Design a protein around this ligand. Structure first.
Ligand code: PLP
Ligand code: PLP
Lengths: 409, 409
């Protein structure tokens, strides 16, 4: 006779990714660093396995007034933090409309809030075939309806055809639906929708919004934004959210976790776009309440970091440290993609993000075999996720070789 | 037609504390520090009106390795953080049975989680007449039923009689209920239930728990624990939670916000107490699923701060600093109570907390006059809340005299 309510009763299951990383660390503890290829979890590590913490982020925290760490942030976050999020996130491609950013605990807080506020119980969140688990978990936490569509065509492009069928089905069922896209730099695939795949996406939603009884919410998860190109090309798609119908709402989920190596500081934002002023003020009012009821207010130090980072002398230093980081990951991926070509290993085309993905049918058998050799990766029904963000350049050719051996027999 | 759902739409007006607080700052701007008595918000300020950030707390953050700040915290919180929460919170008074702690974004995190997991939709949260507003807000967010009972008797002791009839009413309309008690150091009143008053409560809920069709959850908000006695006497009541029937669960909402002057770091915990091992594991599973969906994980630096504060050499310094902070606060309450007596001002007996409370029915009218004299406090239907944590000893007499005059004329 459970004490918890049904919606809050969870029949466990082991934390798989938690288990794998435990094994990886144990292996490092037994065999030593260079013997292990630790590619489980999604955190940027230097070639020596140490977690990267950008000096141009943490030098600010060291320098910061005690009071800017101690005091409460406002419910919605610092007035300047809100403004800098919008400036930073969209760069030179801010969409035309009413835009507001409210602070959240990382990107997670933003995603949760969208799903809570813009979907009712029966209503569906339509998501891609390969996805970050918490999306489903959030739906299930709040009794919203998680629903997947096949991500890729046979050629590994956006399966826009099947995307349409799944949206059509959503609108056939509910007068309110939501569509979640995790791009650019999709976890787990590494895929990014092309600027022209985004065109096809937003043109179709505008079509479906014609029926003004329908309300549609697009949730874009951009956590990996700064890791999907030179910082400009991957922001270009934002312009396509300009002047959308009133019943087509966009919520971007911003996070400092990845872009600022500030995972443990839990600082992101939900950013809403609307061609209506009352819709956005309603966005603000709804999430202000949720913030007050769930976390109260964000990590103040982190918001102030982002503010101090927008200062000219600091902005410059951060820009280079980012470019350097951005590059380290990219050439790691370029070794990977080049090796995969040599070793005839089929992989979802890499466009950005912390991971490369190998589609397979024996995903759990293959990790089993690899773990015997001290190579650690994450399996799933779809295939193997490889945390390229954790493995230095030299260990990658071995990784791809042993990966292809087990995947192709 | 709103974009947000019925539950997420908030036709809600002005933020009252916010506004009062802006007014105070604008006044300080116009007339200057000494001319103004800013007794609005619950933050420990020194005699100069500036926030208090305990060196023993923030030195640890200063000396901490970046990796401990930057990296993700485990869902539940660091293994040692969870343990050290339980030890620190209960002191020598740890109740018997199974106990688990789960990191939350401040105390707010712990409270909402309890309300989500242990009340369903029709279900009542029975809370005292004078309450911190977000309790009601959370119920409304999640569709739980907020329900009040008259806190005090005419002599200003816990209204055990009315409390009983309120709980009786819950257990008559629903198979599942919850009691919320913010003690010791109740915001707004400053009241603490005595040990025998707690006895009267647990003994009564034990009687209700005899009906094994009914499930009851006691939520205790102990944010101001360290500011409600000499450290020891105020914790004694925790022993009353030992060996409670399977169907009487207890969630204690712990916070570093006040005790560690760490509000903007957002770090608390939800600590559960049960005689059943599976009730606890069920609790662990539920709050971990909630954490994953709502905030992903806690502010890692803050958890490590608590761990590092546990080192004997790092502990001595912190206690001696907490004693002063606690003693600076109490002697402010002494000056208040001494003045209130001599100015003939009826006030709810103060036992601990950040606020002293003047009961009155003209509270909104009184604070109009008071603001004209640069005296800022928070009005409610019940009276005036004086944030004694904000104002310095030497100003209290004036604040009390002028408070008495408008309350008594
Ligand atoms: C797609 C995606 N969104 C969000 C997050 C996490 O965001 P945050 O740490 O800011 O809560 C991650 C997890 O690493 C992710 O892969
Ligand atoms: C009764 C009570 N509980 C909880 C809190 C806040 O806890 P936290 O800031 O850690 O979320 C406060 C608000 O200041 C409070 O007065």
């Amino acid at each position: 006779m459970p004490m918890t309510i049904k919606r809050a009763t969870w029949n466990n299951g082991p934390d798989l990714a938690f288990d794998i990383n435990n094994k990886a660390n144990a292996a490092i503890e037994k065999y030593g660093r260079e013997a292990v290829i630790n590619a489980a979890l999604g955190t940027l590590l230097d070639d020596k396995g140490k977690i990267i913490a950008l000096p141009s982020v943490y030098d600010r925290l060291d320098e910061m007034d005690r009071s800017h760490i101690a005091s409460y942030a406002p419910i919605e976050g610092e007035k300047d933090y809100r403004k800098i999020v919008i400036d930073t996130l969209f760069g030179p491609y801010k969409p035309e409309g009413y835009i507001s950013a409210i602070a959240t605990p990382g990107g997670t807080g933003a995603i949760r809030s969208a799903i809570f506020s813009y979907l009712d119980e029966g209503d569906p969140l339509i998501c891609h075939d390969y996805y970050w688990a918490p999306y489903r978990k959030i739906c299930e936490e709040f009794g919203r309806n998680f629903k997947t569509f096949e991500f890729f065509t046979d050629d590994f492009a956006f399966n826009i055809d099947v995307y349409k069928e799944a949206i059509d089905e959503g609108i056939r069922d509910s007068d309110r639906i939501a569509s979640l896209i995790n791009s650019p730099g999709n976890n787990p695939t590494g895929y990014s929708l092309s600027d022209e795949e985004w065109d096809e996406v937003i043109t179709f939603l505008k079509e479906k919004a014609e029926d003004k009884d329908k309300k549609i919410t697009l949730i874009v998860d951009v956590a990996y934004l700064e890791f999907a190109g030179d910082g400009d090309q991957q922001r270009k798609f934002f312009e396509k959210f300009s002047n959308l119908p009133r019943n087509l709402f966009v919520v971007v989920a911003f996070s400092m976790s990845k872009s600022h190596t500030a995972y443990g500081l839990r600082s992101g934002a939900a950013v809403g776009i609307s061609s209506s002023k009352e819709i956005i003020e309603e966005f603000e009012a709804s999430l202000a309440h949720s913030a007050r009821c769930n976390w109260s207010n964000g990590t103040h130090a982190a918001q102030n970091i982002l503010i101090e980072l927008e200062r000219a002398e600091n902005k410059k230093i951060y820009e280079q440290e980012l470019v350097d980081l951005r590059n380290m990951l990219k050439s790691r991926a370029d070794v990977f993609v080049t090796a995969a070509k040599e070793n005839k290993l089929t992989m979802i085309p890499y466009f950005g993000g912390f991971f490369t993905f190998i589609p397979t049918d024996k995903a759990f058998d293959i990790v089993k075999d690899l773990e015997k050799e001290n190579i650690f990766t994450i399996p799933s029904a779809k295939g193997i996720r490889v945390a390229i963000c954790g493995v230095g350049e030299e260990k990658i050719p071995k990784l791809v070789q042993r990966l292809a051996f087990y995947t192709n027999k």
